[PDB]
Amino acid sequence: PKQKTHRGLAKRVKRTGGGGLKRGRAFTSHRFHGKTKKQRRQLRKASMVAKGDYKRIRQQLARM
Amino acid sequence: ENGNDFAALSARNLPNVSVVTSDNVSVLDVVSANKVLATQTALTQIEEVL
Amino acid sequence: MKLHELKPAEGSRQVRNRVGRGTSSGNGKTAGRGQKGQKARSGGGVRLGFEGGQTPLFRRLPKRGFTNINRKDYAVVNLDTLNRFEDGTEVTPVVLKEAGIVKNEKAGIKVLADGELTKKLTVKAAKFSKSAQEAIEAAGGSIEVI
RNA sequence: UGAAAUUUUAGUACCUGUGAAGAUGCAGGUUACCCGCGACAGGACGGAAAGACCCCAUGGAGCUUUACUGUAGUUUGAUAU
RNA sequence: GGUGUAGUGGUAGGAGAGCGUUCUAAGGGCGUUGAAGGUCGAUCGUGAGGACGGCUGGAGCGCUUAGAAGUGAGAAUGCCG
RNA sequence: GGUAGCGGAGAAAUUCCAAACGAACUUGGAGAUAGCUGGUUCUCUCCGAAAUAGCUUUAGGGCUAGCCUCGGAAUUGAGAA
RNA sequence: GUAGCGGCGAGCGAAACGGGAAGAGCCCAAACCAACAAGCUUGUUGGGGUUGUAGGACUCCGAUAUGGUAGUCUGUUAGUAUAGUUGAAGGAUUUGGAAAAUUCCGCUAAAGAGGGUGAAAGCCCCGUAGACGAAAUGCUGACAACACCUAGGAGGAUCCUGAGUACGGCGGAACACGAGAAAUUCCGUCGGAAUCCGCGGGGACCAUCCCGCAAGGCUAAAUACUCCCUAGUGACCGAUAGUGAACCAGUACCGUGAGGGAAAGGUGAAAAGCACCCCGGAAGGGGAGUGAAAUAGAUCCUGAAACCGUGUGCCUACAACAAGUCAAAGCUCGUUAAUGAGUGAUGGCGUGCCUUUUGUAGAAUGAACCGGCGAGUUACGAUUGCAUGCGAGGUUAAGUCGAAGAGACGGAGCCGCAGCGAAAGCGAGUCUGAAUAGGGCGAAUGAGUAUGUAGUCGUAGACCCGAAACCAUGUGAUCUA
Ligand SMILES: [K+]
Ligand SMILES: [K+]
Ligand SMILES: [K+]
Ligand SMILES: [K+]
Ligand SMILES: [K+]
Ligand SMILES: [K+]
Ligand SMILES: [K+]
Ligand SMILES: [K+]
Ligand SMILES: [K+]
Ligand SMILES: [K+]
Ligand SMILES: [K+]
Ligand SMILES: [K+]
Ligand SMILES: [K+]
Ligand SMILES: [K+]
Ligand SMILES: [K+]
Ligand SMILES: [K+]
Ligand SMILES: [K+]
Ligand SMILES: [K+]
Ligand SMILES: [K+]
Ligand SMILES: [K+]
Ligand SMILES: [K+]
Ligand SMILES: [K+]
Ligand SMILES: [K+]
Ligand SMILES: [K+]
Ligand SMILES: [K+]
Ligand SMILES: [K+]
Ligand SMILES: [K+]
Ligand SMILES: [Mg+2]
Ligand SMILES: [Mg+2]
Ligand SMILES: [Mg+2]
Ligand SMILES: [Mg+2]
Ligand SMILES: [Mg+2]
Ligand SMILES: [Mg+2]
Ligand SMILES: [Mg+2]
Ligand SMILES: [Mg+2]
Ligand SMILES: [Mg+2]
Ligand SMILES: [Mg+2]
Ligand SMILES: [Mg+2]
Ligand SMILES: [Mg+2]
Ligand SMILES: [Mg+2]
Ligand SMILES: [Mg+2]
Ligand SMILES: [Mg+2]
Ligand SMILES: [Mg+2]
Ligand SMILES: [Mg+2]
Ligand SMILES: [Mg+2]
Ligand SMILES: [Mg+2]
Ligand SMILES: [Mg+2]
Ligand SMILES: [Mg+2]
Ligand SMILES: [Mg+2]
Ligand SMILES: [Mg+2]
Ligand SMILES: [Mg+2]
Ligand SMILES: [Mg+2]
Ligand SMILES: [Mg+2]
Ligand SMILES: [Mg+2]
Ligand SMILES: [Mg+2]
Ligand SMILES: [Mg+2]
Ligand SMILES: [Mg+2]
Ligand SMILES: [Mg+2]
Ligand SMILES: [Mg+2]
Ligand SMILES: [Mg+2]
Ligand SMILES: [Mg+2]
Ligand SMILES: [Mg+2]
Ligand SMILES: [Mg+2]
């Protein structure tokens, strides 16, 4: 059968032009009083999936 | 060429001969045969097909 | 070629590796699986992305965004491709399709200015970038919105 | 007349020591001509049973309750007849 | 192909190159003047393995190239004899 | 002759229900599942580990990194002593 | 594997558009009219009518045609199925028991598919190509016959157009959609409409617009499957294989019963299956015969290993042995003729194989021995390497024709050529931001795609064997309570 896509990942990541995966940042839901404004400002920015994590999950996003 | 039924009938039974119509010719047939005896009309039809 | 002298192109075909066929082969006994453990069992191994119970990366990360029901994506074409036509040519979505430049137009053709235009053309497309429109006009041509 | 459990192959000694720390098989020494029969049961950690004790498995099953979630029944009301 | 230098223990495991088995295609062969198979031999190759001769046997079988695999056993208290 | 397994029967022992009853026997779901034990068959050549860190209802499992192997790219040569 | 669903986990997962196979549309209820009977309506029958660019009734006109059928044991006809007939061409030579094999000359082919015949046959036989054939019964198609459907235009004043229905509340269920914002569809319960200025849907809901007309029914083809029958096919099995069953197999056997369930093929070309004689009670042998062969004698082709036994070339009764290896006198023998073979006094060294382990000769595990069988495979996807074709392009899928082939057509569709953003949107840029700033992701800085093959992974039992168990049908009180 067709290989299925991991819907959770599909919702949380985006494929970039270079083949990488763009992702959100954790610790951006609540309890912002426990983080400095610098932390919040720098977590607002997106990021890319690390090499090790990408090698673990790529097969689940092949046909995203 | 299509329609040469009598030629096909007289030739098919020979052990060394394989008969095919110009419209129905295949890589395997050509390669297997050591020689290819083709009528002029058959060659024309082959060229048109290819 | 002769059926009794067939020869594949070098490197075109390889020999399958069979495991569990003696020690000297290098994959005897354990068949390259190692010794015991979950991965050494038939049907063994954990599901993709599993991390042994540590919260997986997707669980850590938050969901984001939404898909617009009325999303419109345009088939994109550039001045470099437009250069393939002759001066005075009437470029149309049908013309592009027949030329094979745009097999699938999606919501319609949008023209971008990645390349440098050189031919005078009358280009008809769903949308035009500002730079693309200026380049077409500078090349002596004209643009119309279908 | 005629089985069986067992059985890696065995030309299958003792002491001290060594060794996965308790050796017929390894080291040193000692003893011992070859093959049996009738008896004994120290050893072959002897045979029989993939230990039941103990621990482990995000195993099973039976049982309990003020564990959780359900539920048959029982009861109460609305409503239809 | 030659010279030189260096290197060539190895479990898990990775890479490469090969042997052998059955079958398919093509080509080229072998067989009651004895095939396969069995057995014996003091044979050849670096290895898996390959020949050759004697005997038994009595009808199918190699070889080269390529292709496909129910393709290689010594262990599973494996199954059957 | 009657009582049949989500059951029956029980002067009550988890006692009996066709020589193993804390839930009979047979068939099917079914090749249940087994992070566990056992087994996994030809050859040679090159190279060759780990038994660690982090996290884990995690501890004899797993994931990423570390250590091995094969291919590739590039360098103001960045490695070792 | 998209949109979505989902302790938003594990997973589940569409539909429309587009491309194809096949194609077919029709009947009522109601209004209205007539007949009949009863009790002006009220039931039966007939006529009438079947719809959304609203239709029908009804009222006018004009037509009494034109076409069709998804009807019939109605006939006629053609074909076909169920037996069959015909169907070319070789003799010698050598070996051999036997010729098809060898050699020499020939012959046939619309037949050189295949099978059998004393070994391997185009020309020996059965067949094959081709030609031909049906008294009888089926089946199919056509023809006719019968049968049944088939009307156009105009007006709306009124009438009809499916009621306990649609819908709503409550509780469930099906829709990929798990109540969620929830459409749509279905069930149970209760409430409960409108009706052409009407009604439903377009994913809560309202308005506009668009599309359609429920609560009645029927309908061939394309699709699914094979217990069977016929004709074939296979890089399918070849007697531990292949159906459990090649053989008197669901048999023997086991169980009270449901149920479980085997083993077992081969003489020879032809029985020519050993007349007769001898030992023996027979069995079984030895002759004699058959046969090419009887060590092919019915336990019958071949006849391996374990295991057993006979004969003997060498060694062995002072020796402590994982049984070998290295060295070696003596004796024996003469081979793929090799700086040979067998045996071996004696001396040196030396604790099996496998599994699992930090570590095993291990007093840890497994194997009594021999033989056979017995474990990473395939399908569909993902990704990487290698290879080929093409190349800013690559490529067809279903499907039609065709030998179960290749191949041709089929461009719908898929990947690539533009990215950025959650999105509107912009675009070699874009997002953030007040910013022509910075920064992120991209372009400059270009190769992809189809297929083959291999490595790995995913869904599948997924390398093989193994639970205690769980669940759903059944069979058991001939034991025992
Ligand atoms: K995210
Ligand atoms: K947070
Ligand atoms: K491996
Ligand atoms: K030990
Ligand atoms: K004893
Ligand atoms: K129990
Ligand atoms: K065994
Ligand atoms: K009792
Ligand atoms: K899909
Ligand atoms: K979960
Ligand atoms: K009518
Ligand atoms: K004959
Ligand atoms: K023949
Ligand atoms: K007939
Ligand atoms: K709903
Ligand atoms: K509609
Ligand atoms: K014989
Ligand atoms: K002997
Ligand atoms: K010795
Ligand atoms: K033990
Ligand atoms: K900026
Ligand atoms: K920028
Ligand atoms: K390529
Ligand atoms: K590939
Ligand atoms: K499997
Ligand atoms: K696999
Ligand atoms: K009784
Ligand atoms: Mg902090
Ligand atoms: Mg292959
Ligand atoms: Mg290895
Ligand atoms: Mg092994
Ligand atoms: Mg193991
Ligand atoms: Mg371990
Ligand atoms: Mg492991
Ligand atoms: Mg000690
Ligand atoms: Mg000791
Ligand atoms: Mg010893
Ligand atoms: Mg014991
Ligand atoms: Mg145990
Ligand atoms: Mg053979
Ligand atoms: Mg095998
Ligand atoms: Mg064995
Ligand atoms: Mg008790
Ligand atoms: Mg009992
Ligand atoms: Mg199941
Ligand atoms: Mg946890
Ligand atoms: Mg004839
Ligand atoms: Mg002849
Ligand atoms: Mg549902
Ligand atoms: Mg309701
Ligand atoms: Mg509705
Ligand atoms: Mg809407
Ligand atoms: Mg309409
Ligand atoms: Mg149908
Ligand atoms: Mg046999
Ligand atoms: Mg059988
Ligand atoms: Mg013999
Ligand atoms: Mg025999
Ligand atoms: Mg002495
Ligand atoms: Mg002596
Ligand atoms: Mg230990
Ligand atoms: Mg044992
Ligand atoms: Mg009774």
Residue C137 makes CB contacts below 8 A (sequence gap 6+) with: C143
C97 is in an annotated binding site: no
Give me the resolution in angstroms, 1 decimal: 2.9
Q: Is C84 left (phi over 0), alpha (psi -120 to 50) or beta?
A: alpha
Q: Which residue reads 């949380």 in tokens? A: A12
Interface partners of chain B (CB pairs < 8 Å, 3 or more) are C
Of all ligands present, the nearest one to the C-alpha of A8 is 1
* Domain assignment of residue C96, given as a range: 75-145
Contact residues for B49 (Cβ-Cβ < 8 A; gap 6+):
B22, B23
**Interatomic separation, CA of residue A18 and C1' of nucleotide G292, rounded (Å):** 85
Q: DSSP letter at A2?
A: P
Q: Do C62 and A24 touch (CB under 8 A)?
A: yes
Q: C110 φ, ψ to 5°?
A: -115, 135
CB-count burial class (<10 Å; 0-12, 13-18, 19+) for B32: exposed
- Give the nucleotide nearest to C40 (CA→C1'): G463
**The domain that contains C132 carries what CATH number?**
3.100.10.10
Question: What span, in angstroms and rounded, lies between the C-alpha atoms of C83 and C111?
Answer: 13
Q: Looking at CA atoms only, how far is residue A1 from chain C in angstroms?
A: 17
CA distance B18 to C94: 49
Decide: helix, strand or coil at residue C95: helix
CA of B6 to the centre of ligand 17 (A): 55
Chain C residues 3-62 within an 8 A CB cutoff of chain B:
3
Residues of B with CB under 8 A from a CB of C: 31-32
Cβ count within 10 A of residue C76? 15
Give how far the C-alpha of residue A39 lies from the chain's centroid of Cα atoms, to the nearest Å: 18
* Distance from Cα B45 to the centre of ligand 57, integer Å: 67
Asked if residue C28 lies in contact with residue C21, where contact means CB atoms within 8 angstroms, the answer is yes
User: Which structure tokens are listed for C71?
Assistant: 């999303």
Residue that the structure tokens 């060429």 belong to: B1
Q: Which two tokens stand for residue A12?
A: 């949380």
| Record: contact A12-C63, CB cut-off 8 A | yes
